[PDB]
């Protein structure tokens, strides 16, 4: 409808796949080459389904901060025959608050879904499903089961991936440029 949804759509159409693990279907953001991200609660193994095709996982790393606290981001390298468009220049360098964000989801259940979630707070610490978690972004939208792995954007920036909610608020793990240096 506007430049927010325009930027979100541009990311969804070229930089997302549908990932299936034994824990369900997730929106999965491709970042560069064969490297993507997914919530750590997806429990990625040696094999994953990418758009319903059996795919070997070449590497997977559940990120933690230097306090050894969960970040809820898993970086996955896929044995795929095709690279993602490199979107690392759209990643923030620092932890921040944002205005006017969009959460975008693409699964079998929720194809072509875009949610204007509004103001995003640098919330920080969250007890997420019983697990102490750092670098959490919060937005005041009643997000539901099916939205995990959803991409949070502003005009010009890819800022996080949706990892949970409490029925009134939704929570995203930050994406930082420093996670994807090579």
UniProtKB/Swiss-Prot annotation:
The active site annotation covers 41 (for protease 3c activity), 72 (for protease 3c activity), 148 (for protease 3c activity)
Q: Where in the cell is the protein located?
A: Host cytoplasm
Listed as disulfide-bonded, the cysteine pairs are none
Q: Which reaction does it catalyse?
A: Selective cleavage of Gln-|-Gly bond in the poliovirus polyprotein. In other picornavirus reactions Glu may be substituted for Gln, and Ser or Thr for Gly
Q: Peptidase C3 domain spans which residues?
A: 2-180
**Record text on subunit structure and interactions:** Interacts with host IFIH1/MDA5; this interaction inhibits host IFIH1.
The function of this protein is: Major viral protease that mediates proteolytic processing of the polyprotein. Cleaves host EIF5B, contributing to host translation shutoff. Also cleaves host PABPC1, contributing to host translation shutoff. Binds and inhibits host IFIH1/MDA5, thereby inhibiting the type-I IFN production and the establishment of the antiviral state. Cleaves host MAP3K7/TAK1, resulting in inhibition of TRAF6-triggered NF-kappa-B induction. Cleaves host TICAM1; this interaction allows the virus to disrupt host TLR3 signaling. Cleaves host IRF7, resulting in inhibition of type-I IFN production.
Q: What is this protein called?
A: Protease 3C
Parent-record interval covered: 1549 to 1729 of 2188
């Amino acid at each position: 409808m506007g430049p927010g949804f325009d930027f979100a759509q541009a990311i969804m159409k070229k930089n997302t796949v549908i990932a299936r693990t034994e824990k369900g279907e997730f929106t999965m953001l491709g970042v560069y080459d064969r490297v993507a991200v997914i919530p750590t609660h997806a429990s990625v193994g040696e094999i994953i389904y990418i758009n319903d095709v059996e795919t070997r996982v070449l590497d997977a790393c559940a990120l933690r901060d230097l306090t050894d606290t969960n970040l809820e981001i898993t970086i996955v390298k896929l044995d795929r025959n095709q690279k993602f468009r490199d979107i690392r220049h759209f990643l923030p360098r620092c932890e921040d608050d944002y205005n006017d964000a969009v959460l975008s989801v693409h699964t079998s259940k929720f194809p072509n879904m875009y949610i204007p979630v509004g103001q995003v707070t640098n919330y920080g610490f969250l007890n997420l499903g019983g697990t102490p978690t750092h670098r959490i972004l919060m937005y005041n939208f009643p997000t539901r089961a099916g939205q995990c792995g959803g991409v949070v954007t502003t005009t010009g920036k890819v800022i996080g991936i949706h990892v949970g909610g409490n029925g009134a608020q939704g929570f995203a793990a930050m994406l930082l440029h420093s996670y994807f240096t090579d």
